[PDB]
Amino acid sequence: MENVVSAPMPGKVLRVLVRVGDRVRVGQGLLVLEAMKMENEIPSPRDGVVKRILVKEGEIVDTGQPLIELG
């Protein structure tokens, strides 16, 4: 049971697609992570509510780094 969206690889947080409190669906893109001339939509692992967004747009993140917590 997944509660935290973490970075699958290092990247730059290009865009955060949802806000705290928003309802989300499994497989929905929640943010866009840029890496190696590619824009990766990072999905919600489950239906739920966005509780916390732990990064800002522009931020560089490393592998496994927490990005979003679901409530």
Author numbering: 79 to 149
From the paper:
We previously determined the crystal structure of the C-terminal 73-residue fragment of PhBCCP (PhBCCPΔN76) that represents the biotinyl(/lipoyl attachment) domain of the hypothetical methylmalonyl-CoA decarboxylase γ chain. This domain adopts a flattened β-barrel comprising two homologous ‘hammerhead’ structures that confer an intramolecular pseudo-twofold symmetry reflecting the gene duplication. Moderate deviations of up to 2.53 Å were observed at residues 114–116, which constitute a flexible β-turn harbouring the Lys115 residue to be biotinylated.
In the PhBCCP system (PhBCCPΔN79) residue 138 was selected as the target residue for the mutation experiment because it is a solvent-exposed and nonconserved residue on a surface β-sheet. Moreover, in modelling it could be replaced by any other residue except for proline without intramolecular steric hindrance. The isoleucine mutant (A138I) and the tyrosine mutant (A138Y) conferring residue 138 with the highest crystal-packing propensities for β-sheet provided better crystallization scores when compared with other constructs, including the wild type. The crystal structures of the A138I and A138Y mutants were determined at resolutions of 1.9 and 1.5 Å, respectively. In these mutant crystals the crystal-packing interface involving residue 138 differs completely from those of the other two crystal forms. Neither the C orthorhombic nor the trigonal crystals could be obtained with the wild-type protein. Therefore, it is conceivable that the substitution of Ala by Ile/Tyr with a better crystal-packing propensity created novel packing interfaces. On the other hand, the crystal packings of the A138I and A138Y mutants are rich in attractive electrostatic interactions and nonpolar interactions, respectively. In terms of buried ASA, the residue at position 138 in the mutant crystals contributes more to crystal packing when compared with that in the wild-type crystal.
